[PDB]
Amino acid sequence: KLVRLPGLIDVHVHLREPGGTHKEDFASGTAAALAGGITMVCAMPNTRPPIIDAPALALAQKLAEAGARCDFALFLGASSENAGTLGTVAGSAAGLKLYLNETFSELRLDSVVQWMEHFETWPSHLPIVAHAEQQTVAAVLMVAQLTQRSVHICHVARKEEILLIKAAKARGLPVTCEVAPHHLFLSHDDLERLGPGKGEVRPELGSRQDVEALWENMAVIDCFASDHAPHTLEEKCGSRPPPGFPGLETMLPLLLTAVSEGRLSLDDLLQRLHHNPRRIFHLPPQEDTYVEVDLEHEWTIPSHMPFSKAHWTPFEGQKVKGTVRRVVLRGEVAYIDGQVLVPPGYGQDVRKWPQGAVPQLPP
Amino acid sequence: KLVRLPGLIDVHVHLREPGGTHKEDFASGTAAALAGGITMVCAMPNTRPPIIDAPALALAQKLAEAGARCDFALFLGASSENAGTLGTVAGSAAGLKLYLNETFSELRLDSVVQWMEHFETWPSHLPIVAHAEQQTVAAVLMVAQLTQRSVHICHVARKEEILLIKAAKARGLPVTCEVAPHHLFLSHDDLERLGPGKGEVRPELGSRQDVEALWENMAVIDCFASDHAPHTLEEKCGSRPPPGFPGLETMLPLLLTAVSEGRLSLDDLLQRLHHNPRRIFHLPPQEDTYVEVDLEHEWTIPSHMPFSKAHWTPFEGQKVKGTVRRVVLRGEVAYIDGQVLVPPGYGQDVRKWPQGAVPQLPP
Ligand SMILES: O=C(O)c1[nH]c(=O)[nH]c(=O)c1F
Ligand SMILES: O=C(O)c1[nH]c(=O)[nH]c(=O)c1F
Ligand SMILES: [Zn+2]
Ligand SMILES: [Zn+2]
Ligand SMILES: [Zn+2]
Ligand SMILES: [Zn+2]
Numbered sequence: 065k066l067v068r069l070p071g072l073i074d075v076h077v078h079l080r081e082p083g084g085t086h087k088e089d090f091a092s093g094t095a096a097a098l099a100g101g102i103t104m105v106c107a108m109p110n111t112r113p114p115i116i117d118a119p120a121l122a123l124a125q126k127l128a129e130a131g132a133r134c135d136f137a138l139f140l141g142a143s144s145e146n147a148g149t150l151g152t153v154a155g156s157a158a159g160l161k162l163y164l165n166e167t168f169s170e171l172r173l174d175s176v177v178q179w180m181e182h183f184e185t186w187p188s189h190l191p192i193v194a195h196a197e198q199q200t201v202a203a204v205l206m207v208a209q210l211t212q213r214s215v216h217i218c219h220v221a222r223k224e225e226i227l228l229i230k231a232a233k234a235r236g237l238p239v240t241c242e243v244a245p246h247h248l249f250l251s252h253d254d255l256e257r258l259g260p261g262k263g264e265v266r267p268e269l270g271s272r273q274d275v276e277a278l279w280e281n282m283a284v285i286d287c288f289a290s291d292h293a294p295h296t297l298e299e300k301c302g303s304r305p306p307p308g309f310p311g312l313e314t315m316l317p318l319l320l321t322a323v324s325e326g327r328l329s330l331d332d333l334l335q336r337l338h339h340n341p342r343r344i345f346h347l348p349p350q351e352d353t354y355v356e357v358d359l360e361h362e363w364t365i366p367s368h369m370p371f372s373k374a375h376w377t378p379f380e381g382q383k384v385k386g387t388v389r390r391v392v393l394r395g396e397v398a399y400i401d402g403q404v405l406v407p408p409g410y411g412q413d414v415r416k417w418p419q420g421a422v423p424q425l426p427p
Numbered sequence: 428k429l430v431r432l433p434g435l436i437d438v439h440v441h442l443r444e445p446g447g448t449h450k451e452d453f454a455s456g457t458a459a460a461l462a463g464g465i466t467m468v469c470a471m472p473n474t475r476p477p478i479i480d481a482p483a484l485a486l487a488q489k490l491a492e493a494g495a496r497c498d499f500a501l502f503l504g505a506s507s508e509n510a511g512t513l514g515t516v517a518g519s520a521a522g523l524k525l526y527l528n529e530t531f532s533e534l535r536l537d538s539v540v541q542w543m544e545h546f547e548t549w550p551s552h553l554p555i556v557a558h559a560e561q562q563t564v565a566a567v568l569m570v571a572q573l574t575q576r577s578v579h580i581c582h583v584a585r586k587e588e589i590l591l592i593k594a595a596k597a598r599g600l601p602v603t604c605e606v607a608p609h610h611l612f613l614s615h616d617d618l619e620r621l622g623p624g625k626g627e628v629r630p631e632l633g634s635r636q637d638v639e640a641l642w643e644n645m646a647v648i649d650c651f652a653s654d655h656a657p658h659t660l661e662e663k664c665g666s667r668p669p670p671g672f673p674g675l676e677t678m679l680p681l682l683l684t685a686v687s688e689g690r691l692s693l694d695d696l697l698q699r700l701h702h703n704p705r706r707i708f709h710l711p712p713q714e715d716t717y718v719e720v721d722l723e724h725e726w727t728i729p730s731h732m733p734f735s736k737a738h739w740t741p742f743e744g745q746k747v748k749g750t751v752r753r754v755v756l757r758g759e760v761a762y763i764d765g766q767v768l769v770p771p772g773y774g775q776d777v778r779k780w781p782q783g784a785v786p787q788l789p790p
Contacts, residue, residue: 175587176561176562176565177586180591180594199566201566202569202570206565210594227540228539228540231543
């Protein structure tokens with residue numbers, strides 16, 4: 065028998081359009097999403113041009129409307145120059161993304177004062193998410209407290225980080241977080257197989273103790289999100305390997321395997337890939353939308369999944385139990401057993417739906 | 428006419444004994460202190476052995492009692508192994524020092540969870556100070572809030588850091604800080620003259636804008652403290668230059684010059700080199716103790732000051748106006764015009780004085 069799930073949401077993907085379309089584009093990346101049982105994605109702003117101003121957002125919105133096969137929201141990115149300039153378009157974005165560790169120059173913040181300025185100027189009712197590793201988690205939490213608002217921490221990867229967040233939650237601080245599949249299912253032990261190029265990712269793969277700590281502290285994890293970060297094999301295996309793994313097509317199969325093994329429950333999964341993404345990011349329901357999965361079928365992850373242009377995967381060789389069989393999106397069959405059946409452009413910007421605007425107090 | 432000042436206190440010095448006595452020892456370092464108008468010093472724990480346990484503290488206490496010419500308190504240092512082990516000796520120390528950025532392996536903390544453990548286990552009534560640069564300031568402030576206590580930030584060197592602290596103080600958070608003379612009187616502009624070896628210090632020399640920001644935000648600075656960090660010229664000019672400047676003998680002359688120029692008042696100076704050190708660290712008064720300075724005498728800083736074994740100074744060539752003429756410590760003439768007149772061992776551990784114990788609620 066098939067199990068019917070609601071439309072799953074991935075709040076952290078890199079779809080590379082504009083400007084990196086050999087790595088992925090809206091059409092290929094959203095095909096990958098649907099194949100992974102994901103019907104709504106939130107796309108990060110570190111494209112070329114990066115989504116750091118109104119014109120870049122407008123361009124990305126049209127590229128997404130024309131290419132996306134599933135529904136989406138687009139993040140804006142914080143820069144050293146745009147604090148206090150995004151007020152008119154802020155509500156149209158998934159949220160604001162801060163890159164607080166490594167990134168390219170356009171998104172680099174050189175001072176915590178710049179973080180403060182963003183927390184002070186970004187509308188208080190809208191989401192802020194951060195790439196914030198190790199001590200940077202504590203630092204951005206401090207900025208959030210000084211400015212008396214919430215923050216969501218992207219891809220938590222370490223015992224250190226999840227325990228800090230746990231302590232913050234115990235103090236009633238408004239912080240949420242997500243964890244990516246590679247930080248639950250891969251570790252340092254896998255670097256021998258992957259090699260130093262393929263294995264490059266930020267946050268880096270953790271120790272066995274890091275992975276164990278994330279599982280032990282599942283209660284502290286609000287969301288799963290792939291951090292789908294496609295690069296071609298040539299790039300990953302070259303002289304200056306970019307960090308990141310593709311992950312849309314493998315996330316749900318990996319997690320379903322863990323459900324099958326009793327490592328977490330189906331509800332635990334659905335809180336983290338549906339309900340909590342909805343509530344943290346104020347994402348609307350999708351009418352007539354559901355995913356049918358098969359929990360019995362055992363298979364081995366191949367050297368590349370069918371859809372991502374990355375055309376490789378760090379999970380090659382892992383045995384999984386769990387398969388996406390069918391996806392229906394807003395009343396149309398979007399995916400069946402390896403075939404995507406909705407065209408580029410079927411997808412819509414959920415922030416334009418009346419139910420997808422973030423509620424706020426009147427002026 | 429001479430101006431009579433109270434006995435000045437430097438809460439941040441490295442006296443290198445035990446184990447680095449070619450760089451400085453208690454006798455030479457405290458001679459330097461007296462020559463700089465300083466009658467009480469707090470010595471950092473990054474010696475060899477480092478002061479991270481009771482036996483090392485006991486050794487350092489005896490070396491200081493035998494060698495110090497001025498009065499002192501000794502810091503304990505946080506390590507990855509000693510949280511929850513220092514309770515019996517904590518009250519005998521100046522406070523607990525956390526090295527949160529670069530340091531040697533024995534004092535390295537690999538996780539913010541280790542910082543949390545120290546804040547939770549160190550007695551709540553006793554001082555904690557941190558080497559915490561840039562975002563690390565925000566991170567350690569977060570740990571302090573989670574554990575609902577105060578923290579003092581060592582050598583604030585950047586616009587970013589002083590503005591973060593300013594914002595924290597505006598929110599009523601219990602944080603204090605100190606600034607070292609090199610971050611007020613030297614900058615990037617001086618690296619050409621100093622060279623890359625001599626110029627090595629942590630925190631590094633800041634931009635002109637950093638220096639300007641510290642002066643503009645003098646109200647936010649609770650203490651001046653030298654971070655006297657002596658290394659020999661051979662070491663500074665060698666293949667792996669250690670970071671740090673000697674500074675006991677130049678701190679007061681530099682600051683008196685600024686007082687003379689109306690950059691801050693004499694009271695501003697005395698709050699920062701006497702009253703605030705006393706109150707933050709619960710340091711006792713010194714009976715019959717005072718410093719007489721001459722504010723008229725103009726001189727140029729030489730290539731080395733008379734007492735520090737570092738035998739060099741990054742302030743060489745700077746013109747100053749202000750000289751220490753005489754120091755009286757506990758009723759004895761300790762220094763006159765270049766001559767130290769109290770022997771090694773004259774100095775005492777102020778934490779052993781009845782008035783130098785930190786008051787606490789009964790068990
Ligand atoms: O865009 C990427 O490739 C990327 N890859 C990573 O591994 N971490 C990131 O923070 C990131 F932005
Ligand atoms: O002990 C030292 O030499 C030293 N020198 C520095 O410049 N910064 C430090 O944090 C330090 F511990
Ligand atoms: Zn990231
Ligand atoms: Zn990412
Ligand atoms: Zn330091
Ligand atoms: Zn120091």
